Design a protein around this ligand. Structure first.
Ligand SMILES: Nc1ncnc2c1ncn2[C@@H]1O[C@H](COP(=O)(O)OP(=O)(O)OP(=O)(O)O)[C@@H](O)[C@H]1O
Length: 367
RNA sequence: GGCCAGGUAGCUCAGUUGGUAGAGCACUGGACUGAAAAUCCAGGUGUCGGCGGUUCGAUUCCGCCCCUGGCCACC
């Protein structure tokens, strides 16, 4: 219906950005980005009016958001910078060639992909390429983004883009960039399943040394990251109903050798979940003594008492130890699974004493 | 859209090793009165947001959502 309304208004609307990319990548998303030559606001208002849904106008930005079913629509007016601006001018201000393309929703040319910079070729060649040599200088945040994309889509930076990126990092532009955009970029990064590869790209171009103060790469942390990769794989395989956010674990591994001050400050900036802060504060101190207690574990009930109160994240961190691995697993798929019939429990009940008694019965069953 | 608080009576507010809930003023009833108020005895002051899951047992552990306020990402 968008092409129809745009036809009535004598306008030109287009699907633009990553939304296009994901379409060519086959991935279907509920968020669609529109670029409109002429006023996008009235188009969005009319579209929202015909479908009988609410509209969220932003005149100063010149963009309007409206939701139809599960679809989230954003209409934006064509702009040359972040006289009427052409579509080409609006696409050339973007980051990479794969994100620079567009698909016309206008009824006449409908279905046509509009690509000026050859982003289709780069998409087919798996290449992350900047539009202009000053790209990373303009927006240093992109330095992360590229890597992130190269992590997700398993693409490669072009020689141009790579040299330009390395130059951009060498100038320390990553420090000049707004802290918030960078932190948000990392937050976007850790949510990826291929995020480990993104971390490899972060190590290669050494951006984390720039962003995080006092951070340096070593081998033990890397091996811990691959071990955590395996553990995450297994846990998300068998226990997949129990899944949590895995990226935060990797983030904790990265900052493990860092000072508690810088760690707490960084996790503060990252707006990390509560369980992440708890798992970190537990990892920095009590984790060692906990492991030492797990080494002294003989009966299964002691293992129970030492494990069950802990979160899943702590357990996954405990699986990093080779000796503790099979123990943790045994606690997972076996130890904590058990129950009791009616009459028996009825005899058990005859306050806290019921709990202590139940514990005595459990340690009676285990050992 | 991300996160942090806040969610406890009608209103304004505390509560951690899971184990049988609280304050200040409104609420009912009776003693008291010509009526009413005060006051006394008392006692409702409540599925401690909603829905599932783990647990013998969840305000608490977790997951998904509702509401309100604040930090922002608001390309
Ligand atoms: N820093 C930037 N510089 C230039 N263009 C950008 C920048 N950030 C975003 N864009 C453009 O705006 C669009 C915003 O899309 P969005 O913010 O959802 O990110 P994305 O590329 O879609 O990845 P994701 O879906 O993971 O967020 C992108 O398609 C990109 O082309």
């Amino acid at each position: 219906m968008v092409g129809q309304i745009a036809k009535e208004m004598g306008l030109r609307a287009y699907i633009v950005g990553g939304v296009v990319r994901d379409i060519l990548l086959g991935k279907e998303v509920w968020d669609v980005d529109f670029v409109v030559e002429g006023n996008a606001i009235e188009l969005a208002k009319e579209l929202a009016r015909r479908h009988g849904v609410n509209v969220h106008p932003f005149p100063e930005f010149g963009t309007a958001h409206l939701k139809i079913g599960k679809l989230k629509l954003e209409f934006a007016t064509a702009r040359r910078e972040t006289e009427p601006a052409s579509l080409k001018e609006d696409l050339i201000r973007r980051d990479f060639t794969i994100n620079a393309m567009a698909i016309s929703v206008n009824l006449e040319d409908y279905g046509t992909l509009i690509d000026y910079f050859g982003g289709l070729r780069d998409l087919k060649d798996k290449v992350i390429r900047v539009l202009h040599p000053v790209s990373f200088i303009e927006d240093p945040v992109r330095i992360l983004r590229a890597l992130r994309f190269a992590g997700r889509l398993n693409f490669k930076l072009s020689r141009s883009t790579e040299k330009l990126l390395k130059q951009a990092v060498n100038l320390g532009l990553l420090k000049e960039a707004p802290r918030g955009r960078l932190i948000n970029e990392i937050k976007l990064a850790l949510r990826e399943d291929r995020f480990l590869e993104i971390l490899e790209l972060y190590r290669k171009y050494r951006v984390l040394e720039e962003i995080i103060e006092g951070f340096q790469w070593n081998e033990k942390v890397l091996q811990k990251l691959y071990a955590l990769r395996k553990v995450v794989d297994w846990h998300a395989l068998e226990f997949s109903e129990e899944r949590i956010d895995y990226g935060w674990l990797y983030l904790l591994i990265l900052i493990s050798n860092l000072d508690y001050e810088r760690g707490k400050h960084f996790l503060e900036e990252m707006s990390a979940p509560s369980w992440v802060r708890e798992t970190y504060k537990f990892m920095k101190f009590k984790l060692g003594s906990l492991k030492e207690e797990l080494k002294k574990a003989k009966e299964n009930y002691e293992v129970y008492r030492l494990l069950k109160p802990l979160h899943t994240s702590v357990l996954l961190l405990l699986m990093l130890e080779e000796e503790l691995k099979e123990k943790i697993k045994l606690y997972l798929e076996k130890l904590r699974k058990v129950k009791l019939p009616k009459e028996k429990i009825e005899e058990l009940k005859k306050g806290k004493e019921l709990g202590e008694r139940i514990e005595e019965l459990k340690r009676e069953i285990m050992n």
